[PDB]
């Protein structure tokens, strides 16, 4: 408004000729152009000099061409539905469509309650084949005696898992929380199963939204990951992806002190993921050591070359078995693809480059690995080449 | 069960009969449920599927309304037989009979019967597509519709009073049903052919109905659209429409309220994966394509990890070219998108800032673009 | 039939590792050598695998795709956007394996061959590739069925 008031006092209208008026109106137009906020564009446009100077036909053109710079967009997000309920089957199909479209667990419970109310003995976990519950959970989830409870637990698990797949973490959190608080009453095994699922969902939610800018975990998720790693409960159905993601979570947040020292001994002999994470943390924390690094870099070298070796035409990529390691090569590649920590990634790159250079490529800490290997004939160097190419592609996707 | 034996005999007796059975059905339609019941298990329904739409005109509708003196329970049984036959019998003229049925819904009792026929068909298809959570069910009606998905999207985008609800539901059912997941293709057609926010709302509604059962739809839709853009396909009006609709979607998500939060589409994140494809579109000879690409890239977020030096340098070169081209053509009002893109690129890294400043000053001092500055 | 190929569609669509994708593509490959007509069900999924990052499943995707297109010339126009995407891809291996299969695809398509060989030239010209042998072979054979 000081600029506009100086503009008003310095023009001397009805005596300023065409030259000053055109220059001054062009200046007002071009200072309207540079305004990032549109309220300032109406602030200049509402001034008497701005209206007086230009025309009565280009002011509207300018204000609409500035309004279209950052337009307000409105869009419907509710999916289409032609719900015109005459017969029982029409109402059943209508409520099944609502159930499949639904993501709020309380609405799902309402729909399932009235669906069991109308029908006699029909199950309703089967009204969509896109609902996938993992096969380790299918037996424990279809053994629920109550029909409505079994249906509701199956639907909540399936929708929570699919929401975690499509990165809908808040809705998955609501669905898993509802399923957990529903199975606290009648099943400790299901309570434990959705505890594990809730932990995995919390890990994914943190690594998607709460991470991504370099801030630490809230230290209760770290305690939960520790407790799940040190769990040792045999009756519960376990998914190996949860333990794999827990080890990846520990590696991604430089929890080398837990992975090297504070890990229980029985976990290393049972889970290959924990053993590999311990070895990676050990070879990462010992990097400023000249010879102490070799003691763990060696063990990482043998375990990785035994992963990438073939026992007994045979190709490691074509067969995926007859490998000597604690892991398949696919599982090792997927586990590394769960890692975003740059030091761990460059350690694995140096390892696989040194393995590839045997039968050159320079990759940082390449001297920490042994050169002479045992069972060189067992190593599928084609598989090593494919692994190092996919690994460098993944790391360049992590940090271009 | 003499009707079953008669149908079993007539199924074998109808070998290579392409005119006699049609003539018998035409003569029997002059004065029907007995034929339809035995036609469920025979390909004569598939053969007469094309002839049913051509034969039916208003005189046959008035005759059916005159023959509608059957009890309402028998009428509902005949309607269930009709939806079963059209769902599991229609082989190649499914789109023509579909357009006839939708067209014969907009004698009022025949319109009501066709409306109930379409609603019951949609409910039956919703049952057949996804059930028994075992090999998948094969729906012959929807098997003939994957080749007409573009026409279905175009008819849905007309946005009439009632037809677009049915065709949108059928698009969603087709997207769920197809094992190769034709959903990204339909979403791409809707994005590339929408002209209004009302027409753009159909894509968001389809994705909202699809994200509850399918995953990764937007990256595949974007890849298919941009592959068609970079080939000779998708003539540049549709390219500009797709680019400005995607800009509308990304901006709508950026002004996030309850809408983008409930949808959870991640339009900007999925569009960020295709900046190497969107950057050459600033250099497009068509002006509308170039300005739509500029408006998209001014607000499209960068990839969360970083920008590659090749990606960053290509983006900066295309941005400064777009800036000078829009300064020459549209003057100072037309450079807003390029200025926003270059300002965002300069804040990514000191290398990006140095690239933006160096290329801007060098382009401004070139033998070209120097008459702009005297 | 399309009912017996649904698990193969599911394995090819959900293949994350190179091992799973390679084994399902090879399993499609033997019974494509037996029954060539089954490849029409795998069309767009081979188009997705056409621009794969690694080499063996990408080469197998080109092989199975071109085998599918050897039967029906109408399939040839449907592979145009993915082939021109492979020619103009940022990945250099994908560009090389698209240039190696360029004359066979140009022979198979023949209504989009001008745009295809123009894209191959401009990839060779503004890149650092020499597709002049492939372009010359494609132009020679295209002339041979042009004079017929």
Curated annotation (Swiss-Prot), chain A:
Transmembrane feature ranges: none
Localization: Nucleus; Chromosome
Swiss-Prot/TrEMBL TPR repeat ranges: 153-186
Subunit structure: Component of the Integrator complex, composed of core subunits INTS1, INTS2, INTS3, INTS4, INTS5, INTS6, INTS7, INTS8, INTS9/RC74, INTS10, INTS11/CPSF3L, INTS12, INTS13, INTS14 and INTS15. The core complex associates with protein phosphatase 2A subunits PPP2CA and PPP2R1A, to form the Integrator-PP2A (INTAC) complex.
Function: Component of the integrator complex, a multiprotein complex that terminates RNA polymerase II (Pol II) transcription in the promoter-proximal region of genes.
Similarity remark: Belongs to the Integrator subunit 8 family.
Associated clinical condition: Neurodevelopmental disorder with cerebellar hypoplasia and spasticity: An autosomal recessive neurodevelopmental disorder characterized by global developmental delay, profound intellectual disability, seizures, absent speech, spasticity, facial and limb dysmorphism, and subtle structural brain abnormalities including cerebellar hypoplasia.
Entry text on domains: The WFEF motif is required for the recruitment of protein phosphatase 2A (PP2A) to transcription pause-release checkpoint.
Name this polypeptide is given: Integrator complex subunit 8
Organism per entry: Homo sapiens
Biological classification of the source: Eukaryota, Metazoa, Chordata, Craniata, Vertebrata
Gene from which the chain derives: INTS8
Residues of the full protein shown: 416 to 830 of 995
Swiss-Prot record, chain B:
Protein name in UniProt: Integrator complex subunit 5
Role summary: Component of the integrator complex, a multiprotein complex that terminates RNA polymerase II (Pol II) transcription in the promoter-proximal region of genes.
Species, as recorded: Homo sapiens (Human)
Subcellular location, record wording: Nucleus; Cytoplasm; Nucleus membrane
Family, similarity comment: Belongs to the Integrator subunit 5 family.
Chain ranges passing through the membrane: 202-222
Self-association and partners: Component of the Integrator complex, composed of core subunits INTS1, INTS2, INTS3, INTS4, INTS5, INTS6, INTS7, INTS8, INTS9/RC74, INTS10, INTS11/CPSF3L, INTS12, INTS13, INTS14 and INTS15. The core complex associates with protein phosphatase 2A subunits PPP2CA and PPP2R1A, to form the Integrator-PP2A (INTAC) complex.
Residues represented out of the complete protein: 290 to 706 of 1019
Curated annotation (Swiss-Prot), chain C:
Disulfide bonds: none
Compartment list: Nucleus; Nucleus membrane
Primary role: Component of the integrator complex, a multiprotein complex that terminates RNA polymerase II (Pol II) transcription in the promoter-proximal region of genes.
Subunit and interaction comment: Component of the Integrator complex, composed of core subunits INTS1, INTS2, INTS3, INTS4, INTS5, INTS6, INTS7, INTS8, INTS9/RC74, INTS10, INTS11/CPSF3L, INTS12, INTS13, INTS14 and INTS15. The core complex associates with protein phosphatase 2A subunits PPP2CA and PPP2R1A, to form the Integrator-PP2A (INTAC) complex. Interacts with ESRRB, ESRRB is not a core component of the Integrator complex and this association is a bridge for the interaction with the multiprotein complex Integrator; attracts the transcriptional machinery.
Disease listed for this protein: Neurodevelopmental disorder with cataracts, poor growth, and dysmorphic facies: An autosomal recessive neurodevelopmental disorder characterized by severe global developmental delay with motor impairment, cognitive delays, absent or severely limited speech, dysmorphic features, hypotonia and cataracts.
Record family assignment: Belongs to the Integrator subunit 1 family.
Protein name, as recorded: Integrator complex subunit 1
Organism: Homo sapiens (Human)
Part of the intact protein present: 2043 to 2190 of 2190
């Amino acid at each position: 408004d000081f600029l506009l008031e100086v503009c008003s006092r310095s023009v001397n209208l009805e005596k300023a000729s065409e030259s000053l008026k055109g220059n001054m109106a062009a200046f007002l137009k071009n200072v309207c152009l540079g305004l990032e906020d549109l309220q300032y564009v109406f602030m200049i446009s509402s001034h008497e000099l701005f209206i007086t100077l230009l025309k009565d036909e280009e002011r509207k053109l300018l204000v609409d061409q500035m309004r279209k710079r950052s337009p307000r967009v409105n869009l419907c997000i509710k999916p289409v539905t032609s719900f015109y309920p005459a017969s029982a089957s029409v109402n059943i199909g209508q409520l099944e469509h609502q159930l499949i479209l639904s993501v709020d667990p309380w609405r799902i419970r309402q729909i399932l309650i009235e669906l069991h109310g109308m029908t006699s003995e029909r199950q309703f976990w089967t009204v969509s084949n896109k609902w996938e519950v993992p096969s380790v959970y299918s037996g424990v989830i279809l053994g629920i005696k109550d029909n409505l409870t079994r249906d509701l637990v199956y639907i909540l698990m399936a929708k929570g898992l699919h929401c975690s797949t499509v990165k809908d973490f808040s809705h998955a959190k609501q669905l898993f929380a509802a399923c957990l608080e529903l199975v606290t009453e009648f099943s400790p095994k299901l309570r434990q199963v959705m505890l594990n699922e809730m932990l995995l969902l919390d890990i994914h939610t943190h690594e998607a939204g709460t991470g991504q800018a370099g801030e630490r975990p809230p230290s209760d998720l770290i305690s939960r990951v520790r407790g799940y790693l040190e769990m040792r409960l045999p009756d519960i159905p376990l998914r190996q992806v949860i333990a794999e993601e827990c080890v990846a979570f520990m590696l991604n947040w430089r929890e080398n002190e837990y992975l090297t020292l504070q890990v229980p001994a029985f976990l290393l002999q049972s889970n290959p993921y924990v053993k590999l994470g311990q070895l990676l943390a050990a070879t990462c924390k010992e990097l400023p050591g000249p010879k102490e690094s070799r003691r763990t870099a060696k063990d990482l070298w043998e375990v990785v070359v035994q992963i990438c070796s073939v026992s007994s035409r045979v190709s490691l990529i074509k067969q995926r078995e007859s490998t000597l390691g604690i892991m398949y090569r696919s599982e090792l590649l997927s586990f590394i693809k769960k890692l975003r920590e740059p030091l761990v990634l460059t350690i694995i790159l140096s390892l696989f480059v040194k393995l590839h250079n045997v039968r050159d490529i320079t990759a940082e800490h390449i001297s920490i690995w042994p050169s002479s290997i045992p069972n060189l004939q067992s190593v599928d160097f084609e598989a090593v080449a494919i692994t190092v190419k996919e690994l460098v592609r993944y790391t360049l996707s992590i940090n271009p | 069960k003499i009707a079953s034996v008669v149908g079993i005999l007539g199924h074998l007796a109808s070998r290579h009969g392409d005119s006699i059975r049609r003539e018998l059905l035409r003569m029997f339609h002059d004065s029907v449920p007995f034929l339809l019941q035995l036609a469920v298990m025979s390909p004569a329904l598939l053969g007469t599927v094309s002839g049913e739409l051509v034969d039916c005109p208003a005189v046959l509708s008035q005759l059916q309304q005159h023959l509608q003196g059957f009890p309402r329970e028998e009428l509902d049984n005949m309607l269930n037989l009709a939806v079963h036959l059209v769902s599991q019998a229609s082989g190649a003229g499914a789109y023509r009979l579909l357009q006839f049925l939708v067209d014969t819904a907009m004698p009022d009792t025949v319109r009501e019967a066709c409306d109930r026929l379409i609603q019951l068909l949609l409910l039956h298809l919703q049952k057949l597509v996804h059930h028994r959570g075992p090999p998948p069910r094969l729906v012959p009606f929807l098997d003939a519709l994957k080749n007409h998905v573009g026409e279905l999207c175009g008819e849905t985008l007309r946005l009439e009073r009632k037809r677009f609800l049915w065709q949108h539901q059928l698009l969603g059912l087709l997207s769920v049903y197809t094992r190769p997941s034709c959903g990204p293709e339909a979403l791409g057609h809707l994005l590339s052919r929408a002209r209004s926010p009302e027409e753009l709302s159909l894509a968001t509604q389809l994705y909202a109905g699809l994200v509850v059962s399918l995953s990764g739809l937007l990256p595949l839709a974007f890849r298919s659209c941009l592959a068609r853009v970079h080939a000779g396909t998708l003539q540049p009006p549709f390219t500009a429409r797709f680019l400005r609709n995607l800009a509308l979607l990304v901006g709508w998500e950026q002004q996030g309220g309850e809408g983008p939060a409930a949808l959870g589409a991640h339009f900007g994140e999925s569009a960020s994966a295709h900046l190497s494809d969107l950057a050459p579109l600033l250099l497009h000879p068509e002006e509308e394509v170039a300005e739509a690409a500029a408006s998209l890239l001014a607000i499209c977020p960068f990839p969360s990890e970083a920008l590659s030096p090749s990606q960053l340098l290509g983006l900066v070169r295309a941005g400064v070219h777009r800036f000078f081209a829009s300064l020459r053509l549209h003057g100072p009002p037309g450079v807003a998108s390029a200025c926003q893109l270059l300002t965002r690129l300069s804040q990514t890294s000191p290398a990006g800032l140095k690239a933006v400043l160096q290329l801007l000053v060098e382009g401004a001092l070139h033998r070209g673009n120097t008459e702009l500055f005297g | 039939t399309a009912a017996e190929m649904a698990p193969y569609m599911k394995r090819l669509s959900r293949g994350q590792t190179v091992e799973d994708l390679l084994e399902v593509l090879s399993d499609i490959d033997e019974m494509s050598r037996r029954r060539p007509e089954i490849l029409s069900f795998f069309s767009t999924n081979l188009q997705r695998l056409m621009s794969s990052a690694e080499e063996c499943c990408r080469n197998l995707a080109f092989s199975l795709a071109l085998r599918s297109m050897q039967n029906s010339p109408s399939i040839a126009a449907a592979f145009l956007p993915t082939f021109m995407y492979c020619l103009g891809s940022q990945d250099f291996e994908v560009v090389q394996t698209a240039l190696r299969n360029l004359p066979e695809y140009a022979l198979l398509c023949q209504e989009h061959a001008a745009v295809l060989l123009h894209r191959a030239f401009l990839v060779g010209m503004y890149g650092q590739m020499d597709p002049s042998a492939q372009i010359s072979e494609a132009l020679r054979i295209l002339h041979m069925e042009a004079v017929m």
